[PDB]
Structures are given as structure tokens and as C-alpha cells.
């Protein structure tokens, strides 16, 4: 969808928090930093 | 192909004026010299004047100098000759001659004729 | 500064493009052939009057 500056990617599943696109989905889970996954 | 066209001549009196003229035809007139050359009845040639390609004078005789005017015309491509104060020592077959080479402009000043015509016979008596 | 409010909620904004800009000036033309005759006409032999 682009580069996404400013948050790491886990490898783990989660339900979608925020819709980034082609499947990527972002949320703000446990230090406290913004994830994707 | 050269067609150097001669006009203006005939029986004057010594002191009047006259104009001679040589239009060309066959070749470009902005690019040659043409220089007017008198010849005397079986005593040789004598140069009178010349003019190059642009408007510009090269010299006179020892004894045609203030009395004869020359110039040139590229809108009419012809090449004029006034004359003035004329004596019984002016009598002579007055050729149209032109130049061979182009007149670029760095070279030696060495001017030869080329092409010749047929004169006209300007008589003073 | 775009929601026009001091409290923006959880989501994606659209707030400006990325837009990489100039780093030079390139004005190319073909080369120089056939010079106009400019050296018979200011370097000239005599002139007449």
C-alpha cells in the first residue's frame, strides 16, 4: 500500500484495528508503540 | 552562361560626362568582383577601376584619380562608371572583366580576371 | 490541523501528498553547424564610400 514509516511488523494475527491496507492492519498493543501485523 | 551586358558609349565632347554600365547575368551577384579595364586601338590594355564583391573601392590609376567614380548596385546587380573632365587621351575599348575565385574573407589581395565582354567604344574628340 | 480540532480519534487521516522536488536546471539544445557570414562582413578588406 506504500511504506509504512513509524511501526513494526509482528508476526503474530490479530483482528483489524485500523485498515492499512492489502491486508495490513494496524493497532496499538503492548512500552506501548504502534504495531502491524 | 555569362552575359556581362555593356551600355553607354559614343562621340562627346573633351569635357563633358558620361555613364557607362555592365549588368551581369548568368551567375550570382554577391559573391565575384568585376573590374573595368580600358584597351587602346593596338597599344595594349590599361586597368582603370574594380570593385569586389561587396561595395568597395581598390584603387585608381596615376591618372584617372578624382575624375572617375565607380560604384556598384546589388538591388540591380549592375556595376556603374562615371566619368569626368574627359580628353582626347581617353579614348579607348573600355572591357567589363570579372573574377574567377570567391573573395572569402582571410586570404592575399590577388585579383585576376576571368570572364571578358565586348567594350564599348567611348570616343572623345 | 485537518479535523480542525484538538482531539483526532483512531484511525488513518489523509492529510497531504509526498512530493519530491527539483535538484537542478538542464537546458540542453542541439550543436552549433553552418555559422552565418559574419566573418566576410565584419572582418572585410576596403570598402568604398
Known amino acids: 500500500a506504500g511504506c509504512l514509516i513509524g511501526a513494526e511488523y509482528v508476526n503474530n494475527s490479530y483482528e483489524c484495528d485500523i485498515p492499512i491496507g492489502a491486508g495490513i492492519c494496524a493497532s496499538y498493543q503492548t512500552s506501548q508503540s504502534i504495531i502491524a501485523y | 552562361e555569362v552575359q556581362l551586358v555593356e551600355s553607354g558609349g559614343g562621340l562627346v565632347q573633351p569635357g563633358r560626362s558620361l555613364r557607362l554600365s555592365c549588368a551581369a547575368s548568368?551567375?550570382?551577384?554577391?559573391?565575384?568582383?568585376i573590374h573595368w579595364v580600358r584597351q587602346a586601338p593596338g597599344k595594349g590594355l590599361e586597368w582603370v577601376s574594380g570593385?569586389?564583391?561587396?561595395?568597395?573601392?581598390?584603387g585608381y590609376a596615376d591618372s584617372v584619380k578624382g575624375r572617375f567614380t565607380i560604384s556598384r548596385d546589388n538591388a540591380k546587380n549592375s556595376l556603374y562608371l562615371q566619368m569626368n573632365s574627359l580628353r582626347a587621351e581617353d579614348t579607348a575599348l573600355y572591357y567589363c572583366?570579372?573574377?574567377?575565385?570567391?573573395?572569402?574573407?582571410?586570404?592575399?589581395?590577388?585579383?585576376?580576371?576571368?570572364?571578358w565582354g565586348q567594350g564599348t567604344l567611348v570616343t572623345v574628340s | 490541523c485537518t479535523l480542525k480540532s484538538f482531539t483526532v480519534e483512531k484511525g488513518i487521516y489523509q492529510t497531504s501528498n509526498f512530493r519530491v522536488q527539483p535538484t537542478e536546471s538542464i537546458v540542453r539544445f542541439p550543436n552549433i553547424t553552418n555559422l552565418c557570414p559574419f566573418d566576410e562582413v565584419f572582418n572585410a578588406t576596403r570598402f568604398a564610400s
Open positions: 572583366a570579372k573574377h574567377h575565385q570567391i573573395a572569402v574573407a582571410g586570404d592575399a589581395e590577388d585579383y585576376y580576371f576571368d570572364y
Open positions: 548568368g551567375f550570382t551577384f554577391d559573391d565575384y568582383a
Open positions: 570593385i569586389t564583391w561587396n561595395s568597395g573601392t581598390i
